[PDB]
Design a protein around this ligand. Sequence first.
Ligand SMILES: [Ag+]
Length: 100
Amino acid sequence: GAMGMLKHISHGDMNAASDASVQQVIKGTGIVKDIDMNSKKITISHEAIPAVGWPAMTMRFTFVNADDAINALKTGNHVDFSFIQQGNISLLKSINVTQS
Ligand SMILES: [Ag+]
């Protein structure tokens, strides 16, 4: 059949929102340096993240649930991630592999 559904392809009609569950979810980047699903800690050598105000250091991030991203995640991989600060505990919400 002739499938030609005239939708707003014109990127300017903002009907969809990029936000949903962003409660100041602090985003950053760095190279994964270790993954421990057992204690749910992922030690990532992370860069200067100005959103939290932390310099380029190696530190572990606690995740709530092992996602498909976290499953396909490997050490040595340069990634961009998103977490929320909880005292000293950096609670990893989501993680994106940008360079493997
Ligand atoms: Ag740190």
